[PDB]
RNA sequence: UAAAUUAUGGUCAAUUGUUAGUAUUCAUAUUAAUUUUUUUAAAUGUUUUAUCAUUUUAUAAAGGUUUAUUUUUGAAAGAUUUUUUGUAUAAAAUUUUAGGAAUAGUUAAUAAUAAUUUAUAAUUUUGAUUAGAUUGUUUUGUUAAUGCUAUUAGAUGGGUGUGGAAAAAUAAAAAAAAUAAUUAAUAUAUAUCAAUAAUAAAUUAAAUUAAUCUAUUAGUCAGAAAUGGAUGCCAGCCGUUGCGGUAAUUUCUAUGCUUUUAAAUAU
């Protein structure tokens, strides 16, 4: 029941009447970039990857 | 705007988006933008 | 009416529907916020008028 | 909001750290006094990182492990991490 | 106009009605018996086959009317003790009649096919039904039972004790004390009788086009047993003027 | 952080329509059950298990004591086999052998241990 | 509600965090919005 | 699967399976009776 | 205290049938009802309403409610919530239920819930009673003192009563309508050979009912179940054909 | 046809072939269990949606009271209901035109629905499996035997075209006089 | 589509409400008119009127 | 809200100015406002006496009968005869591409269509029959029918309709009398639609939001103090150390 | 360059965070999710046969791909029989990085050619090639909403090349050449998924089969609610403005109070 609230969820096994049963993939994950190279010594020579792409 | 995308400041993300702007897309009139 | 010549009495020509007879007197019905003593209106007992 | 403050958290709100040093730091004026600062060390992806945090936890025993949480903003100029409350 | 392609010959379908062909019948693939009431199906089956297939609805209506008649016979009088500690109630037959009327009429479940079988299933004794309800209502006014729950005062003190379908006792409710007879309950019974009388002619399924002397005498019995003097007088005058 | 704004909870109101009595009919009435008498090939439930021991991972021979007699062995269901502390594979094997014998197939299976 | 409106919705500076934000601004902005409202009869008269 | 009776021909071979695929003439006859029901 | 074996699946909620009511399995459901406190007074005591609940008093179990539950007979109220042991005297059957569902509702003996041939149609059975239409079955019931009460039942009723089979003198459970083989019209028809297969207990019901098929196969050189159809085979209107 | 066979879930004649109707359902708590009649290949990958020729419909194996219907005194009509949603056109197309296969559970469900005869799996332990004798079968064949012409006609109607055109329809369809 | 925890295919064709046993609200003996209107029937969004 | 030109009335004005009548009663008849059957229904839908005779087809009088289908022969005979006999009713409804669309419910339920939706009810005795109209409609998403034209239908989410938890998130005794919270003296309960006339029952309506119970964008009314929350939650203060029970139970 | 009407039709668009001279979407709300109060294994013997063999059993996680992953009916379904009819390996578009430059057994023609033919070859600033990141074009979350923010499992070279097709080296919810089973859905050890778990948070009882089970509600300056003692810019508190200088409504503590209620805290 996606349209139901968090506290209103009595169970999660099936949709009781109808609708769309969709997986709640967690978008808010706070992915982290770890700097593994010196500022002027990124291995690539043209494009530099300094953050989550 | 997710904070991890591009730089910490939001203007980094906005500048990164501006390179995909349809009006400023690379062509004969606007070339070698970067 | 079939040839579009009958005088059209559209619903919009109707004005307000007046109250012909007075319905009744609605007396103040009792509620939890109307008590002679305020002792029975407590945060542990009363959460609203109804 | 400030997102560069929690650099050493690396996403997770709780950071499992060890204990090496504990000294005292003077908060930014005019708030005079001494506040207990914990110099702690942890290892993440076979890399050791050391950080200074606020020692909010009250001492009731001897502890070698601690939990670092983001906390709020503190008047101390430079530290941005709090110790987990004692349970 | 004429450069690029000649006009397709299939455009003639829009100008010549002679080419509109349906080489096969609408239900030539075995669906000729899809409609149960079509003259084609009726002719190909026969009257005996028709009654064979409609015996299901016939027996459904028969079961409905048999159960209604049994309930009426059981609860003809509203006062008594049929079981060990259960009493007679008009509410059971009222609920069954409401269920029947909803099956016949309510748009939630349009089971109106039962009405087709009223001609051969409806009992002549049950042809007058609201008169039976008025008679039961007249019997309901015995002074030794609670006007609300129809339970004796001597054996029970709370309304709805010993009744399975009591509406006066919810899951976490409180027991309701026996109500004593009075002019308020007499007028309640009078208003119920008036509503029954109106429905006796308003109902298109069980109601009759003209009222019955049985209904009139049942209503008079209700009035005399509920002690409605001016109401009974006015009823008699309107009966004379009917 | 503080929590849900309002914890949505609902009362329990009994439904007379849902609590109305329901017609039922025992499946044994439609198809009566029976227990096959022991035959010459299988005089007892003990030798029944001995014959129904074929898999190395299904030692049905060791559970002679659990079953009291032929009636118990042919009456106990899968749930009873579970509550009698019998592993899943061997209890399923016992149930399948019993059902095959009831259908008319004696446990004439060659031992595959060797 | 004091003005008597029953079917209306008012929003100031989108999200509340957006500046400026003060009680005087909150009162004067909504009062200006209500003052700058044209009634249906007035609009019809203006359109003729 | 294919049922293999216990009273079948024992393959007196240690380098392979312990039982053969042949069958008793009674087993062949009773198999035909069972196969007749499959055809019905 | 009470100590038992627990497994990971042991915390799975049990299934609840349609007849079953709301269950207070969770602590959130248990707390509000545990909040209330009960007491047995003069106006609350069940023994003071024996003129109305005489059936309840008769069906209650005097002895087993004192040792296994430590609740007095005079302490039980007519609207009691705790489940006590009952000995239904209509068939002498032991069960455990509370008094609130026995007085407010009618929830007594589980076996007597199937007393009538139809749960929906209680008293609508037009069939004669067993004591009249089948005198040969009253002697086959288990002698527990309620034989006459069970004999008063309808022949087509769906009571689940015990029977001492003549095959091996064993007590097996069966239904009286299944035993008699007849059913009330409008209900689901039973098996054609239900009388033959319900004559004995399941242990000894195989060979006697398989004697006739052995005789038939011996006589005819083959066994075929379609002889029942053949004896029926040995005018009817019909519709037209469109092919 | 693999060096190391997936011994847990083997099949016959390899993949992909012989579309078969099954009843797929995720193993959940029994009170939330519901299967799906569906036609798929013999071999299925990790996700069942890869090989899915057509979807037949849901089946709920839970006996439920008929709350939608009014409370009727009919005893048979007040028995528990086991609702199953099935498709007829696609089932017939896959069964006849493509000659698919069926498993025992879908076969039993369709036998209940009236589309198929009872499956071989469901049998009454009371009645044993009978035997046959050639002499008695020949005696019955001689006792009753249908005519060859009528048997050919009924076989033609059952298998080949059955919607025939009679002389009335032929006379109606024949061209009208002006173009003769 | 089929044979999964979130397999949303059997919910695309109309079906009656399931009341075999307790589905979290004791559906086996509870009049679920309000429950159907407030939880079971799909909404336009969280908290909106039933669709 | 609509704005017409100030000369919009000319089309009707010329008709009124050039209308001619034989008599004056024809000119001033009181039913000149009604032209179509919709107007007649809207006018005479109040009283049942005129309506029941003027519009006999409004009330459902003849529905789809239930028939039994010819069973398919089973060549196995009595061996598989028992298989069709179960203890539960088996309900089967056809689906497909054409079938199952709710927008075409009238065509699917119409018996005059050769492609109508098909149903089978296998009774426990083993015979199959056509489903009732209720059973046929049960295979579609439920819809609420209501018409406020003449009589107000039973409105959902009311004082009496909603139960205690949905009303105030607290349990109140469900008594038929002495209910000050519900603002009533005595509620003797007859059957809901027994005494009341059938035509007065026009259905029910539930296509709205119960604001007290559930609303869109449940946000805190004012941030500080933190005690106050959204208007959907109205609760009283919780007592401390309510009561203890000596009896084990 | 004319108005409308034989009158609401063709089925709901709607925004709620007590701030703090002004500029600029950036502290504290709500929803969704993670986090404490201990919920939550991926099973060990696949089978048959003509016997030292043969026949049936074809995509699980391993290896980091942005101009990229594309193919068969020769097995099977499959039917009086023989026989016959057809294919198909190819494409097109969308392709990430703050600070951006060269790439390569290489393009085309020819052919069952050329490690050694012929030619002014091909890729790329309209962002190439290496490098970093990430399993690709039906999945979520938030909102009134053009947005923003997510998603999964699996195609990682050949080298006697079996097979129709390499997908071919532990990993089932696949009954696999005799009806093994249909009273079946219940499932006891070692790494993992949601069957993982959301259950009238306190007053009249469970139409049952009685089967599983405890955690401190957080505060009390501004802003629901504080008085006495101790400390005296010290110890400490802190979402925020800040508080603590000897009357501290902000600390510690006694007691008392507050709460729209089931936590607290952080990312
Ligand atoms: Mg970050
Ligand atoms: Mg790469
Ligand atoms: Mg000061
Ligand atoms: Zn009373
Ligand atoms: Zn009993
Ligand atoms: Zn016996």
Which residue's alpha carbon is at the shortest distance from the C1' of M205? I81
Sign of the Cα torsion J102, J108, J113, J114 reads positive
Q: Identify, with chain letter, the residue nearest to nucleotide M179 (CA–C1').
A: J121
Calculate the angstrom distance between C1' of M256 and CA of L245. 28
Taking contacts as CB-CB distances below 8 angstroms, the residues of chain D near A34 are 10, 45
Residue to mutate among J66, J108, J132, with most L CBs inside 10 A, is J66
Q: How far apart are CA D4 and CA E119, in angstroms?
A: 86
Pairing of strands D65-69, D15-18: antiparallel
- How many CB atoms are closer than 10 A to CB E19? 10
Supply the DSSP string of L73-136, one letter for each residue. Answer: P-TTTHHHHGGG--SSEEEEEEESSSTT-GGGHHHHH-TT-TT---EEEE-TTS-EEPPPHHHH
- In the block, tokens 């906005």 appear at B14
Question: How crowded is the C-beta side of E107, counted as CA atoms within 13 Å?
Answer: 14
Q: How far: E143 CA to M153 C1' (Å)?
A: 78
Using the C1' atom of nucleotide M25, identify the protein residue whose alpha carbon is closest: G18
Q: Could you tell me what percentage of chain L is helix, strand and coil, using 3-state DSSP and rounding each to the nearest 5?
A: 20, 10, 70
Tokens standing for residue I165: 């089979």
Q: From CA E111, how far away is CA L136, in angstroms rounded? A: 10
Taking contacts as CB-CB distances below 8 angstroms, the residues of chain K near L214 are 38, 47
Report the residue of H1, H35, H36, H38 to disrupt the J interface, i.e. the one with the largest count of J CBs within 10 Å: H36
Q: How far is CA J87 from CA J39, K28, L142, in A?
A: 11, 29, 22
Tell me how far apart the alpha carbons of residues J61 and J32 are, in angstroms, rounded to a whole number: 10
Contact residues, chain J, for H37 at CB < 8 Å: 129-130
Instruction: Report the alpha-carbon distance of residue F113 to residue I51 in Å, rounded.
Output: 74
The SS3 call for residue I187 is: coil
Determine if residue J14 is left, alpha or beta; phi over 0 gives left, psi from -120 to 50 gives alpha, anything else beta.
Answer: left
Residues of E in contact with L180 (CB under 8 A): none
Report the residue of chain I nearest L80, measured CA to CA: I225
F46: burial class by Cβ within 10 Å (0-12, 13-18, 19+)? middle
Name I200's Cβ contacts closer than 8 Å, sequence gap at least 6: I165, I166, I167, I208
Bridge partners, J82 (sequence order): L90
CB spacing of L69 vs J118 below 8 angstroms: no
Which chain F residues are Cβ-neighbours of I174 within 8 angstroms?
Answer: 28
C-alpha span between J31 and J29 (Å, rounded): 6
Would the annotation count E149 as a binding residue? yes
For L150, what's the count of Cα atoms within 13 Å in the CB-facing half-sphere?
Answer: 13
Q: What nucleotides of chain M have any atom within 7 angstroms of a protein Cβ?
A: 3-8, 12, 14-36, 39-40, 44-53, 56-60, 66, 73, 75-79, 96-102, 125-133, 138-145, 148-154, 162-189, 194-213, 217, 223-225, 233-245, 258-267
Q: Which chains neighbour E (Cβ–Cβ under 8 Å, 3 or more pairs)? A: F, I, J, L
Question: Structure tokens of I141?
Answer: 């019931």
Produce one character per residue of E109-132: b if its CB has 16 or more CB atoms within 10 Å, e if not.
bbbbbbbbbeeebbeeeeebbbbb
**For residues K38 and L156, is the Cβ–Cβ distance under 8 A?**
no
F71-104 burial, b at 16+ Cβ within 10 Å, e below that, comes to: eebbebeeeebeeeebeeebbebbbebbeebeee
L86: left (phi over 0), alpha (psi -120 to 50) or beta: beta
- Chain K and chain L share a number of CB contacts under 8 A equal to 39
> Is the CB of residue L119 less than 8 Å from the CB of residue L93?
yes
Ligand closest in space to the Cα of D5: 1
Q: Does F55 touch chain H (CB under 8 A)?
A: no
Distance I141 CA to ligand 6 centre (A): 14
* CA-to-CA dists, residue I9 to F57, I5, I6, I12, J27, angstroms: 25, 12, 8, 6, 14
Residue I204 distance to chain J (closest CA, Å)? 13
Using DSSP's 3-state secondary structure scheme, residue J20 falls into strand
Query: What spacing in Å lies between the alpha carbon of I224 and ligand 2's midpoint?
Result: 74
User: Residue for token digits 């269509």?
Assistant: L113
Across the interface, do F30 and L226 touch by the CB < 8 Å criterion? no
For nucleotide M76, give the residue with the nearest CA to its C1': J17
Specify whether the CB–CB gap between D38 and D68 falls below 8 A: no
Q: Which residues of J touch H38 (CB under 8 A)?
A: 120
Nearest Cα to Cα of residue E96 among E136, E41, E141, E40:
E136
Query: For J112, phi and psi rounded to 5 degrees?
Result: -60, -40
The answer to whether F104 contacts J129, with C-beta atoms less than 8 Å apart, is: yes
Residue carrying the six token digits 């049990």: I14
Q: How far is the CA of F22 from the centre of ligand 2 (A)?
A: 67
List the beta strands (DSSP E) in chain L.
89-95, 119-122, 128-129, 154-155, 177-179, 184-186, 204-205
DSSP state for residue F61 in the 8-state scheme: G
| Best of F103, F105, F106 to mutate (most J CBs within 10 Å, chain J) | F103
Experimental method of this PDB entry: cryo-EM
Closest residue in H to J121 (Cα–Cα): H38
Which chains pack against A, by 3+ Cβ pairs within 8 A? B, D, F, J, K
The per-residue b/e assignment along D33-65, b for 16 or more CB within 10 angstroms, e otherwise, is eebebbebebeeeeeeeebbbbbbbeeeeeeee
**CB neighbour list of residue J49: distance below 8 Å, 6 or more residues apart:** K1, K2
Q: Please, what is the end-to-end C-alpha distance for chain G in angstroms?
A: 32
Report residue C31 as tokens. 């509620």
What's the gap in Å between L224 CA and the centre of ligand 5? Answer: 65
Does residue E79 contact residue E145 with C-beta atoms inside 8 Å?
yes
Distance from the Cα of F11 to chain A's closest Cα (Å) equals 13
CA-nearest of I118, I109, I182 to I146 is I109
In three-state secondary structure terms, F49 is helix
d(CA A45, ligand 2 centre) in Å: 15
Pick the residue from chain E with its C-alpha nearest to L64: E113
User: Torsion over CA of E143, E148, E150 and E152, rounded to 10 degrees?
Assistant: -60
Residue indicated by tokens 């200074």: D52
Q: Do A13 and J34 touch (CB under 8 A)?
A: no
Touching chains, D (3+ CB pairs < 8 A): A, B
Can chain B be said to touch chain A, i.e. do they have 3 or more Cβ pairs within 8 angstroms? yes
Locate the chain L residue with the closest alpha carbon to K45. Answer: L216
Nearest to F5 among L163, L171, L230 (CB): L230
Residue-wise burial string across L60-87, b where 16 or more C-beta atoms lie within 10 A, e elsewhere: beebbbbbbeeeeebebbbbbbbbbbbb
The residues near G6 (Cβ < 8 Å, ≥ 6 apart) are: none
Task: Name the token pair of I201.
Answer: 């207990």
Task: Compute the distance from residue B9 Cα to the ligand 1 centre, in Å.
Answer: 12
Q: Which residues contact F38 (CB under 8 A, 6 or more apart)?
A: F44, F45, F48, F70
Half-sphere exposure of K38 (CA within 13 A, CB side): 25
Tokens of L82: 């028992």
- As a rounded value in angstroms, the CA-to-C1' distance for I43 and M240 is 63
Give the span between the Cα atoms of G14 and E5, in whole angstroms: 61
Q: Which run of H or of E encompasses I171?
A: strand I170-175
Angle between helices E90-105 and E130-139 (to 10 degrees): 160
Pairing of strands L89-95, J81-87: parallel
Residues E211, E128: Cα–Cα separation, whole Å: 9
CB-CB neighbours of F32 under 10 Å:
24
Separation of alpha carbons E42 and I190, rounded Å? 34
> What resolution does the deposited structure have, in angstroms?
3.7
Element (H, E) at D50: strand D48-54
Q: At how many degrees (to 10) do helices E130-139 and E183-202 cross?
A: 170
C-alpha to C-alpha distance for E221 and E142, rounded to whole angstroms: 12
Binary contact (F13, K19; C-beta < 8 A): no
- From the DSSP assignment, how many helices (H) and strands (E) are in chain F? 5, 0
What residue of F is the nearest CA neighbor of K34? Answer: F10
Q: What is the DSSP string of B1-34?
A: --SSBSSSSHHHHHHHHHTT-GGG--SSSS----
Chain E residue closest in CA terms to L144? E108
3-state class (DSSP) for residue A34: coil
Contact flag K31-F18 (C-beta cutoff 8 Å): yes
Strand partners of residue I94: I87
C1' of M154 to CA of J47 (Å): 10
Strand-pair partners of I96: I85
- Kind plus residue range of the DSSP H or E element containing H29: helix H25-39
Tokens representing I159 are 């009571």
Cα-based angle A12, A16, A20 (whole degrees, multiple of 5): 80
Q: At what angle do helices E47-74 and E90-105 cross, to 10 degrees?
A: 150
Please, where are the H alpha helices in chain I? 27-35, 54-59, 64-67, 100-103, 130-133, 147-151, 176-180, 194-198, 207-220, 227-233
Q: Report the distance separating Cα L100 and Cα L110, nearest Å.
A: 14
Asked if J109 contacts J84 with a C-beta cutoff of 8 angstroms, the reply is: yes
Q: What residue has token string 């009563």?
A: I161
Coil/strand/helix, residue C12 = helix
Q: Give the span between the Cα atoms of C30 and H4, in whole angstroms.
A: 88
Rounded to a whole number of angstroms, the distance from the CA of F102 to the nearest CA of chain J is 7
Non-local (6+) Cβ contacts of B13 within 8 A are: B1, B5, B6, B7
Contact L92, J86 (CB under 8 A): yes
L141 close to A18: Cβ distance less than 8 angstroms:
yes
For E140, which DSSP code? T
| Alpha-carbon radius of gyration of chain B | 12
Distance CA E221, CA E226 (A): 8
Distance D67 CA to M249 C1' (A): 34
State in Å: Cα L61 to ligand 5 middle: 46
Asked if residues L160 and E159 have their Cβ atoms less than 8 Å apart, the reply is no
CB-count burial class (<10 Å; 0-12, 13-18, 19+) for F42: buried
E122–J contact, CB cutoff 8 A: no
């Amino acid at each position: 029941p996606w349209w139901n609230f968090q506290t209103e969820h009595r169970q999660r096994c099936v949709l009781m009447y109808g609708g769309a049963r969709t997986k709640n993939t967690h978008n808010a994950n706070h992915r982290v970039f770890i700097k593994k190279y010196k500022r002027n010594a990124f291995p690539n020579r043209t494009r530099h990857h300094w953050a989550v792409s | 705007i997710a904070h991890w995308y591009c730089g910490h400041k939001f203007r980094h993300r906005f500048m990164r988006d501006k390179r995909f702007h349809p009006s400023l897309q690379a062509s004969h009139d606007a070339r070698n933008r970067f | 009416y079939a040839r579009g010549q009958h005088p059209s009495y559209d619903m919009v020509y109707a004005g307000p529907m007046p109250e012909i007879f007075p319905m009744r007197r609605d007396f103040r019905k009792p509620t939890r916020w109307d008590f002679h003593d305020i002792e029975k209106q407590g945060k542990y007992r009363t959460s609203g008028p109804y | 909001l400030f997102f560069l403050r929690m650099w050493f958290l690396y996403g997770c709100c709780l950071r499992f750290v060890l204990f090496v040093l504990c000294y005292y730091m003077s908060p930014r004026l005019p708030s005079s006094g001494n506040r207990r600062v914990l110099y702690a060390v942890f290892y993440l992806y076979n890399f050791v990182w050391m950080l200074r945090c606020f020692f909010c936890c009250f001492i009731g025993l001897v502890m070698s492990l601690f939990i670092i949480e983001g906390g709020g903003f503190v008047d101390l100029p430079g530290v941005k991490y709090y110790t987990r409350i004692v349970s | 106009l004429y450069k690029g392609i000649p006009r397709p010959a299939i455009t003639n379908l829009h100008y010549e009605p002679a080419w509109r062909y349906t080489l096969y019948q609408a239900g030539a693939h075995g669906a000729q018996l899809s409609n149960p009431r079509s003259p084609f199906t009726a002719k190909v089956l026969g009257d005996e086959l028709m009654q064979v297939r409609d015996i299901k609805s016939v027996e459904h209506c028969k079961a409905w009317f048999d159960r209604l008649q049994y309930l009426i016979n059981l609860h003809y009088e509203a006062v008594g003790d049929i079981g060990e500690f259960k009493s007679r109630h008009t509410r059971h037959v009222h609920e069954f009649f409401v269920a029947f009327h909803d099956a016949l009429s309510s748009l939630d479940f349009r089971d109106t096919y039962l009405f087709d079988q009223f001609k051969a299933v409806r009992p002549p004794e049950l042809s007058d039904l609201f008169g039976i309800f008025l008679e039961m209502e007249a019997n309901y006014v015995h002074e030794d039972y609670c006007p609300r729950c129809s339970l004796p005062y001597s054996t029970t003190r709370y309304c709805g004790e010993g009744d399975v379908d009591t509406p006066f006792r919810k899951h976490r409710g409180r027991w309701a004390p026996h109500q004593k007879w009075g002019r308020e309950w007499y007028d309640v019974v009078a208003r119920r009788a008036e509503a029954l009388w109106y429905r006796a002619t308003e109902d298109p399924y069980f109601g009759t086009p003209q009222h019955t002397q049985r209904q009139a005498e049942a209503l008079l019995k209700v009035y005399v047993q509920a002690k409605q003097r001016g109401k009974a007088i006015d009823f008699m005058n309107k009966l004379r003027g009917s | 952080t503080y929590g849900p704004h309002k914890s949505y909870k609902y009362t329990y109101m009994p439904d007379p329509r849902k609590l109305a009595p329901i017609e039922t009919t025992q499946r044994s009435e439609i198809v009566p059950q029976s227990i096959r008498p022991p035959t010459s090939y299988v005089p007892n439930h003990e030798t029944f298990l001995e014959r129904a021991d074929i898999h190395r991972l299904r030692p049905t021979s060791d559970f002679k004591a659990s079953f009291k007699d032929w009636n118990d062995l042919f009456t106990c269901d899968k749930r009873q086999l579970r509550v009698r502390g019998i592993p899943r594979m061997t209890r399923d094997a016992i149930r399948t052998a019993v059902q095959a014998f009831q259908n008319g197939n004696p446990p004439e299976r060659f031992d595959t241990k060797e | 509600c004091a003005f008597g409106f029953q079917h209306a919705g008012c929003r100031i500076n989108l999200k509340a965090t957006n500046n400026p934000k003060s009680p005087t601004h909150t009162v004067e902005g909504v009062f200006e919005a209500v003052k700058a409202l044209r009634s249906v009869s007035e609009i019809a008269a203006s359109r003729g | 699967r294919q049922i293999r009776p216990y009273y079948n021909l024992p393959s007196k071979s240690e380098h392979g399976r312990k039982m053969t695929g042949f069958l008793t003439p009674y087993r062949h006859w009773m198999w035909k009776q069972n196969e007749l029901w499959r055809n019905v | 205290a009470e100590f038992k074996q627990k497994s990971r699946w042991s915390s799975v909620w049990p299934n609840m049938r349609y007849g079953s009511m709301f269950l207070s399995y969770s602590v959130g459901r248990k707390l509000p009802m545990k909040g209330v406190n009960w007491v047995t007074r003069d106006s609350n005591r069940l023994l003071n309403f024996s003129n109305r609940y005489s059936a309840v008093i008769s069906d209650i179990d005097v002895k087993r409610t004192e040792e296994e539950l430590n609740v007095a007979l005079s302490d039980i109220r007519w609207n009691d919530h705790r489940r006590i042991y009952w000995k239904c005297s209509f068939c002498g059957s032991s069960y455990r239920k509370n008094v609130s569902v026995r007085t407010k509702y009618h929830a007594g003996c589980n076996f007597c819930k199937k007393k009538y041939p139809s749960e929906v149609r209680g008293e609508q059975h037009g069939s004669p009673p067993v004591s009249q239409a089948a005198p040969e079955l009253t002697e086959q019931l288990v002698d527990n003192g309620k034989r006459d009460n069970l004999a008063t039942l309808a022949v087509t009723s769906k009571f689940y009563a015990e029977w001492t089979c003549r095959g091996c003198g064993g007590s097996y459970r069966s239904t009286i309508r299944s035993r008699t083989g007849q059913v009330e019209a409008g209900q689901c028809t039973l098996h054609p050979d239900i009388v033959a297969w319900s004559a004995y207990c399941p242990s000894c019901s195989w060979r006697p009912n398989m004697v006739p098929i052995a005789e038939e196969v011996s006589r005819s050189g083959q066994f075929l179940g379609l002889e029942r159809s053949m004896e029926e085979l040995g005018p009817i209107p019909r519709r037209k054909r469109l092919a | 046809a693999r060096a190391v066979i997936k011994r847990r879930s083997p099949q016959l004649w390899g993949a992909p072939g012989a579309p078969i109707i099954r009843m797929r359902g995720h193993h959940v708590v029994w009170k939330f269990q519901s299967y799906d009649l569906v036609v798929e290949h013999t071999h299925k990958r990790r996700n069942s949606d890869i090989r899915l020729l057509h979807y037949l419909g849901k089946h709920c194996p839970h006996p439920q009271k008929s709350l939608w219907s009014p409370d009727t005194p009919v005893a048979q009509d007040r028995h528990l209901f086991m609702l199953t949603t099935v498709d007829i056109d696609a089932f017939k197309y896959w069964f006849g035109v493509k000659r698919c296969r069926l498993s025992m559970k879908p076969w039993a469900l369709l036998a209940k629905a009236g589309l198929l005869p009872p499956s071989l799996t469901q049998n009454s332990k009371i009645m044993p499996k009978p035997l046959f004798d050639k002499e008695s079968l020949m005696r019955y064949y001689l006792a009753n035997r249908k005519d060859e012409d009528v048997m050919a006609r009924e076989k033609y109607l059952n298998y080949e075209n059955s919607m025939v055109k009679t002389e009335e329809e032929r006379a109606a369809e024949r061209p009208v006089a002006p173009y003769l | 589509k089929v044979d999964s925890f979130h397999a949303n295919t059997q919910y695309q064709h109309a079906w009656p409400l399931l009341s075999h046993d307790d589905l979290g609200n004791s559906d086996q003996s509870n009049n679920t008119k309000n429950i159907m209107y407030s939880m079971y029937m799909p909404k336009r969004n969280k908290g909106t009127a039933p669709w | 809200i609509t704005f017409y030109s100030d000369r919009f009335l000319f089309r009707d004005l010329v008709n009124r100015r050039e209308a001619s009548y034989a008599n004056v009663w024809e000119m001033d008849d009181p039913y000149r406002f009604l032209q179509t059957e919709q107007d007649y229904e809207d006018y005479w839908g109040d009283n049942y006496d005129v309506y029941r005779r003027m519009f006999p087809e409004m009330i459902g009088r003849t529905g789809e009968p239930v028939q039994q289908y010819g069973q398919m022969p089973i060549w196995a005979g009595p061996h598989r005869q028992h298989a069709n006999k179960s203890e539960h009713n088996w309900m089967f409804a056809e689906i497909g591409v054409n079938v199952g669309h709710e927008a075409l419910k009238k065509l699917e339920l119409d018996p005059t269509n050769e492609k109508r939706r098909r149903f089978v009810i296998r009774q426990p005795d083993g015979t199959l029959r056509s489903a009732k109209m209720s059973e046929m409609r049960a295979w579609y998403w439920k819809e609420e029918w209501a018409d406020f034209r003449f009589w107000a239908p039973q409105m959902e989410w009311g004082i009496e309709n909603t139960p205690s938890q949905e009303q105030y998130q607290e349990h109140v005794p469900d008594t038929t009398d002495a209910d000050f919270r519900k603002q009533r003296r005595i509620q003797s309960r007859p059957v809901k639609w027994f005494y009341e006339s059938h035509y007065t029952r026009t259905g029910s309506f539930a296509g709205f939001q119960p604001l007290r119970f559930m609303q869109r964008r449940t946000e805190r009314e004012v941030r500080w103090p933190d005690v106050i929350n959204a208007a959907v939650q109205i609760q009283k203060r919780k007592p401390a150390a309510y009561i203890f029970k000596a009896i084990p139970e």
